[PDB]
Design a binder for this molecule. Sequence first.
Ligand SMILES: [Mg+2]
Ligand SMILES: [Mg+2]
Ligand SMILES: [Mg+2]
Ligand SMILES: [Mg+2]
Ligand SMILES: [Mg+2]
Ligand SMILES: [Mg+2]
Ligand SMILES: [Mg+2]
Ligand SMILES: [Mg+2]
Ligand SMILES: [Mg+2]
Ligand SMILES: [Mg+2]
Ligand SMILES: [Mg+2]
Ligand SMILES: [Mg+2]
Ligand SMILES: [Mg+2]
Ligand SMILES: [Mg+2]
Ligand SMILES: [Mg+2]
Ligand SMILES: [Mg+2]
Ligand SMILES: [Mg+2]
Ligand SMILES: [Mg+2]
Ligand SMILES: [Mg+2]
Ligand SMILES: [Mg+2]
Ligand SMILES: [Mg+2]
Ligand SMILES: [Mg+2]
Ligand SMILES: [Mg+2]
Ligand SMILES: [Mg+2]
Ligand SMILES: [Mg+2]
Ligand SMILES: [Mg+2]
Ligand SMILES: [Mg+2]
Ligand SMILES: [Mg+2]
Ligand SMILES: [Mg+2]
Ligand SMILES: [Mg+2]
Ligand SMILES: [Mg+2]
Ligand SMILES: [Mg+2]
Ligand SMILES: [Mg+2]
Ligand SMILES: [Mg+2]
Ligand SMILES: [Mg+2]
Ligand SMILES: [Mg+2]
Ligand SMILES: [Mg+2]
Ligand SMILES: [Mg+2]
Ligand SMILES: [Mg+2]
Ligand SMILES: [Mg+2]
Ligand SMILES: [Mg+2]
Ligand SMILES: [Mg+2]
Ligand SMILES: [Mg+2]
Ligand SMILES: [Mg+2]
Ligand SMILES: [Mg+2]
Ligand SMILES: [Mg+2]
Ligand SMILES: [Mg+2]
Ligand SMILES: [Mg+2]
Ligand SMILES: [Mg+2]
Ligand SMILES: [Mg+2]
Ligand SMILES: [Mg+2]
Ligand SMILES: [Mg+2]
Ligand SMILES: [Zn+2]
Lengths: 63, 97, 66
Amino acid sequence: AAVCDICGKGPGFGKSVSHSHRRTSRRWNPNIQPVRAVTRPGGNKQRINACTSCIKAGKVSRA
Amino acid sequence: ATITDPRDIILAPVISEKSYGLIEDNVYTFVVHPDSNKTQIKIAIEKIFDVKVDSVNTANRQGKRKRTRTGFGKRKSTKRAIVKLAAGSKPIDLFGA
Amino acid sequence: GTTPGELRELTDDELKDKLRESKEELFNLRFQMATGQLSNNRRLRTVRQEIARVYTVLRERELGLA
RNA sequence: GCGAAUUCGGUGAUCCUAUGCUGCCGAGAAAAGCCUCUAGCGAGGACAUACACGGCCCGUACCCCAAACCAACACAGGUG
RNA sequence: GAGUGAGAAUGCAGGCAUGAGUAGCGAUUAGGCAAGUGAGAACCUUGCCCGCCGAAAGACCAAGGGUUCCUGGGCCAGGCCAGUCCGCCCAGGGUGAGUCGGGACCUAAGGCGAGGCCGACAGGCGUAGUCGAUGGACAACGGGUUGAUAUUCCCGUACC
RNA sequence: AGCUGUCAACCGAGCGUUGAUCCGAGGAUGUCCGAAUGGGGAAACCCGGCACGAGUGAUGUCGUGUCACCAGGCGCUGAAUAUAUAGGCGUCUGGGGGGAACGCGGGGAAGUGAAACAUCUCAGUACCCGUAGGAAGAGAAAACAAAAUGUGAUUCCGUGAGUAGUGGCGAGCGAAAGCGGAGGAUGGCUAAACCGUAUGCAUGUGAUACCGGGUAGGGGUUGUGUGUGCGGGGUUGUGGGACCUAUCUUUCCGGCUCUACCUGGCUGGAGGGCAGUGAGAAAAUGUUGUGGUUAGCGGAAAUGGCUUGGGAUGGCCUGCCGUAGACGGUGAGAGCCCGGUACGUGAAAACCCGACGUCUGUCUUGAUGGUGUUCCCGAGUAGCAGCGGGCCCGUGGAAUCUGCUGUGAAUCUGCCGGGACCACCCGGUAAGCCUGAAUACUUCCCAGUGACCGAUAGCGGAUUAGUACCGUGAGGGAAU
Ligand SMILES: [Mg+2]
Ligand SMILES: [Mg+2]
Ligand SMILES: [Mg+2]
Ligand SMILES: [Mg+2]
Ligand SMILES: [Mg+2]
Ligand SMILES: [Mg+2]
Ligand SMILES: [Mg+2]
Ligand SMILES: [Mg+2]
Ligand SMILES: [Mg+2]
Ligand SMILES: [Mg+2]
Ligand SMILES: [Mg+2]
Ligand SMILES: [Mg+2]
Ligand SMILES: [Mg+2]
Ligand SMILES: [Mg+2]
Ligand SMILES: [Mg+2]
Ligand SMILES: [Mg+2]
Ligand SMILES: [Mg+2]
Ligand SMILES: [Mg+2]
Ligand SMILES: [Mg+2]
Ligand SMILES: [Mg+2]
Ligand SMILES: [Mg+2]
Ligand SMILES: [Mg+2]
Ligand SMILES: [Mg+2]
Ligand SMILES: [Mg+2]
Ligand SMILES: [Mg+2]
Ligand SMILES: [Mg+2]
Ligand SMILES: [Mg+2]
Ligand SMILES: [Mg+2]
Ligand SMILES: [Mg+2]
Ligand SMILES: [Mg+2]
Ligand SMILES: [Mg+2]
Ligand SMILES: [Mg+2]
Ligand SMILES: [Mg+2]
Ligand SMILES: [Mg+2]
Ligand SMILES: [Mg+2]
Ligand SMILES: [Mg+2]
Ligand SMILES: [Mg+2]
Ligand SMILES: [Mg+2]
Ligand SMILES: [Mg+2]
Ligand SMILES: [Mg+2]
Ligand SMILES: [Mg+2]
Ligand SMILES: [Mg+2]
Ligand SMILES: [Mg+2]
Ligand SMILES: [Mg+2]
Ligand SMILES: [Mg+2]
Ligand SMILES: [Mg+2]
Ligand SMILES: [Mg+2]
Ligand SMILES: [Mg+2]
Ligand SMILES: [Mg+2]
Ligand SMILES: [Mg+2]
Ligand SMILES: [Mg+2]
Ligand SMILES: [Mg+2]
Ligand SMILES: [Zn+2]
């Protein structure tokens, strides 16, 4: 759920920073959404995990 | 090339007091290749010696462990075949009697 | 007792005959040594090498090297 | 090597009939095997008797309530 | 130019004192005599007695061990003494199955797990499967014989 | 000219001047386990299918091949279900595991320091994950610089400097420009505008179309949108290129483009250049080099005297060689006794480095102006915002670089950098790719060295050493 199946977009790693400046490890996960994508006009759908960026760019399509 | 021969299975005769006592009963003991089985040995013995084999019995024997200054060593394990010849068959002349 | 030169002169089937002959001779020698009536121990080594020679020659003829 | 008699009773199982029976509530494996049913194979096939044959691989010695196993010991412990 | 000087760190390794020829020599049964062997005998062998265990300290297995088993030899290590003896040392020998106990038959818990789903990576689970006896199915009994194996070899009679 | 490895002899047998043992190179064989891969399994042991062959009276049995899974080509088939697709068959090509260090990209401690401790430090260390290569990464300016008529890809070394700075301004941390060097390639190829062609998806039966005039014929849908692939064209910052449109110069022969005539194309084949296995296209294949590596062989000169001694290689005294007086050995300090040394010499084969050919590419019309509110110049990109990471820089006035989440442009008057930001100048031309050398390391192999150790030292290991032994196991681990 943190890896896109089209572009390979993975999570980033970094730090959450407290007011007292305590640095704790955390992830920045990609916003990936389940999409029932198609392959040809009017065809069978297949569930894939696509990031919102790919959906916005039209790299996945629906019917 | 591989040219299989029955004699490849049958390595040596067993020479011992028990073995001679069995030869008196027309029963001969051979050391055989560890992988061999009773049927293979029966076929091989009857082909080599041109004799009817009644039954073949087998037994595995673990090698003895011997001490040395260098430490413990182990002799080879072997497989023996007690071969009974059919009644009415010519005795085998190769055990040395 | 037989050299590679002489072995290369025999036909394929004559080599296979010689191989059986040598295996029978080795079998007899092993029994004679277990009975302890074999004087010339060295015949075992020589017969075994003769078998190895015949195999080598046969394999060379299959691989087209002869 | 030769080799007698070998009957009758009594007692009696924690073993067998018994995967039985009777009672109870906590309500007591699976699969192969075997039997049967068709589907589907089928021109050859079933049964019986006689004779001749095949029947593989691993374990098999010895200790095993012990100085041979677990215990540093030829150890008052432990072992189904 | 220095791995350059030890008496001590409850310092480290090896050798060896003191305690001391002292404590022990591991149950709750117990040994004795005659004869033998031998350089040597309380302990080894044989005979005759005595004593102890006898739901065991008898008999047969699984697990585990691995030649400790049998025959011949040995006796400077080992055995809490000695030793001619040994479960110790050395050489040779010894374990025979269609029916016994397993596999080639079957599954249980559980394990692994084609694809698969999940998970940044590492991986986590699991379907079809495939393994996995402590259980299910499946044909042999009595006698004799070796120094050492025997429902295995042999004899008699069976069964799949 | 002696051999049958060694601890290690002893016995018992044999080979060798018809060349053994031994040394180098290339082949053959290579049980079982192990990624382990026919199936199974407690690694090295249990059980098979299929094909061919062997063996049985037949069953049993025995050889030799072949049979895991996944990914990607190619072929067949196309469920629910119509189009189809998922999937299922068949077949070819790969991957899997291991390795001491060095590389790159990710994840990422704590003891500790701060004489407490949380920011900070330790430290992007230890460890871990994914992947390499013989090296890797980086690399051809959306760079620096500061008005100097500057430098000109990257990497690495020395400086700049314990400086500018940074920092509970505590403990600490800590650049870059510039300058001096190593290396030589200030290296190459692509995307678009616009032509040509193939073909997917829409249309159309009429205009269109058929290179373009001026035409003259003809042919009749060959058309017309839009997408994709493959050839031309285009590779740039003084902006460049396409499109136009003057000028001057140009190998030969075709062939084509409906018919000639001009005239554009495009495409063969001859002359000629210019490159090549490399980054700049790929795979081959001959000849040749006292070029190299993997065995070796030769190689000068004292049996010298006397003395000591078991032994001379000691002492004393003579002579000799030296392109050789390295270092060992030999009964005690040996250039002249031995292995050698200086110096020379040698390779059938295999491998490696060349050169030369074949062979493969590629090119062959270029120069020269003008012209323009014409087209193109790498988009979910840049920019911006939120939360982080990293930079000397700990959020700071915080630029530059970078992850995730939103939002989201312009094609040269464009856009991005010159430490907030704006203006003006200067530099550069992002969102495509490739790239040798200078640098890092040594499991292993060869030749050497030491004011290194010399048996409690040196490796844990001079002795069966990762052995004995200890531990269920990871692991620990001697002594001689
Ligand atoms: Mg990070
Ligand atoms: Mg911290
Ligand atoms: Mg073979
Ligand atoms: Mg039998
Ligand atoms: Mg058996
Ligand atoms: Mg022994
Ligand atoms: Mg009677
Ligand atoms: Mg027994
Ligand atoms: Mg014990
Ligand atoms: Mg005890
Ligand atoms: Mg010192
Ligand atoms: Mg001292
Ligand atoms: Mg001391
Ligand atoms: Mg004392
Ligand atoms: Mg006292
Ligand atoms: Mg006292
Ligand atoms: Mg006392
Ligand atoms: Mg006692
Ligand atoms: Mg006496
Ligand atoms: Mg006593
Ligand atoms: Mg009593
Ligand atoms: Mg005994
Ligand atoms: Mg004994
Ligand atoms: Mg004795
Ligand atoms: Mg003794
Ligand atoms: Mg004693
Ligand atoms: Mg299960
Ligand atoms: Mg699983
Ligand atoms: Mg899988
Ligand atoms: Mg099973
Ligand atoms: Mg069971
Ligand atoms: Mg017994
Ligand atoms: Mg396998
Ligand atoms: Mg498996
Ligand atoms: Mg369909
Ligand atoms: Mg790998
Ligand atoms: Mg502190
Ligand atoms: Mg402190
Ligand atoms: Mg590179
Ligand atoms: Mg400062
Ligand atoms: Mg193009
Ligand atoms: Mg400029
Ligand atoms: Mg002298
Ligand atoms: Mg010298
Ligand atoms: Mg650009
Ligand atoms: Mg930061
Ligand atoms: Mg700026
Ligand atoms: Mg690159
Ligand atoms: Mg010493
Ligand atoms: Mg040492
Ligand atoms: Mg422990
Ligand atoms: Mg152990
Ligand atoms: Zn995506």
